[PDB]
Amino acid sequence: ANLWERFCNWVTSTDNRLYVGWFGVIMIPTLLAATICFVIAFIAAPPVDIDGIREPVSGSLLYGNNIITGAVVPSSNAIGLHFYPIWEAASLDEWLYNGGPYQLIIFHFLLGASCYMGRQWELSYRLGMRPWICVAYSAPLASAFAVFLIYPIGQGSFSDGMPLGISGTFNFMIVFQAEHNILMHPFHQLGVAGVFGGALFCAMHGSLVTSSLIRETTETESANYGYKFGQEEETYNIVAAHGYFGRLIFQYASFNNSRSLHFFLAAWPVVGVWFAALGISTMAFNLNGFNFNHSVIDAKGNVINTWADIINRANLGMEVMHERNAHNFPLDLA
Amino acid sequence: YSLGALSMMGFIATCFVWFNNTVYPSEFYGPTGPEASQAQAMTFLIRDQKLGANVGSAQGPTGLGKYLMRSPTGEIIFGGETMRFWDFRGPWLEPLRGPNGLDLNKIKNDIQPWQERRAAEYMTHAPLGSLNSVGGVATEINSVNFVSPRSWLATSHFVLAFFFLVGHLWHAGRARAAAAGFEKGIDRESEPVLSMPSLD
Amino acid sequence: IFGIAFSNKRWLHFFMLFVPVTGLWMSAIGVVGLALNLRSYDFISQEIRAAEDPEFETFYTKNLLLNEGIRAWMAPQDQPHENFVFPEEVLPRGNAL
Amino acid sequence: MEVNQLGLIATALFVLVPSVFLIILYVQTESQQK
């Protein structure tokens, strides 16, 4: 047949071990580029001047890091939101000094990950499935956009993007608390409800279904062999589970409709994590957590401290110490 | 299709009100984030120069100029963290700018009282504040009732733009499924995967 | 999509029990250590290098500076029984802030 | 970097001992009559 037609058939084929698809055509090169650059940088990149003050921070293993302390360090504050590809540098040496790898990695990743979401829609369509798995994945994806793109945009610099490393993540979190009081922000609080609740409901669902598996095996064998891949019948007794959980709380707190149950399992952490992402994305424009500093005042006017004020003291310590050489003027305005 | 378009527009509007001070005049909406940061550098440049500081030759702790430095392409710009905001342009600042960036002669001789006033106003009305409208950084004590219209408009429209992207995906996925005839689930009698070769 | 998938429904649901239950148990263990101040506070190699080499900086050393800020600034009010009085001059602070 | 001199053997044995335990169990399962 036609060459283009045959290529299109291969790309969109439901028979490839890993689905390619049209989103995959962008996803594959961008994720490979992000991955390869990340690995090389994490191992071998020299120190990077993250805060634009000629104070280069070592991120790579060969330059004295371990797994926990290592990072791909964000691009220089001197660059800000400027696009800094390799060809904008006079040399690779300059590019490395200024945090070029970070921009390359995060842009390819965010593109690749957006296509990952689209690819998820795409295969669902090819297989005759319902389409919304990609909608659930939009919660972690949005969260990645929040910390790698949206927050830098709002703050005016990719140097304020989340670092690509374990201790760098903690740095980002602590500074974020100092500057936004994220803990006192209801979107982050909804985020915590999402992930605590998601983990809770994960353990709950797992324990309840596991609790009511139909006896199909002997004592000297795993219960997992009692289910066979693709069997028509259900492997557990949902009436039994419901009977248990309905008596644990009360009858009407327990789901007897599996479709309702599984929708709830999807929705709770997805919605919660959406709010988490929107927390970061709105604090990006400095609409910050609740501020109750000196809210409680006695008859004379003496400040009566609350736990909010104790948080404020910790926030202060973080604030005064962070990027100890970068501030010349009294207010940290971005 | 329309949800996808409105999402895109929402994200654009967010960036417009955050960065643009032409169709979103700072006189009405307040200074932008970049603007207020630049205004602080300007404020302390003025104060310290009035005290006798040679702001051009003042080396900061890092080695970079305390008040003035170069951008990565050489233009003279404000120092400190606001190095990131050197793309900022504003009517109160531009009289000080020449072909090479900020002009040291103009800085020494030509800064008017209205420029000092504006810089101080914008520095102290930076778009930072809490959800309960306490102005300033997160560690500020209660006193000033202020959140910028720029923050209100940026945050709201990011939220709306985001959920509209979710809406786009929801309805785009459903429209495809419904048109192909499987939005209600898989046909038990004709399950497509069952007719496909196994992957391995 | 992902390269791997569940094929056993029973394993799937057990794993869903296993993951968060095991996670919380692990965190409990770490808190037991913190009861005794038996922390993962430092990496000794990092500290030896940094002490000798004032140009060596990592995200680990950066975070310790933040911890030192937290301690000095929160302790007087957070631990009032200690009657801490930290004269302003002793408080750790970076430039300007 | 002046790392602990037992870190290498600690890590190597941490990896090898249980991995070997699993490898032993897997291979003897495969070799059983089907």
Binding site: R17, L18, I43, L61, L62, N66, I67, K228, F229, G230, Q231 | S198, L199, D200 | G3, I4, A5, S7 | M1, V3, G7, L8, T11, A12, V15
Partner: peptide, 30 residues
Amino acid sequence: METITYVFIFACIIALFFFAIFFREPPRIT
């Protein structure tokens, strides 16, 4: 030596991903 150790463990993991995907036990309908 540490760096070698970290890179080694990482490389073993990526190798494991490969075998776990391409040399998995094939799911079968009985």
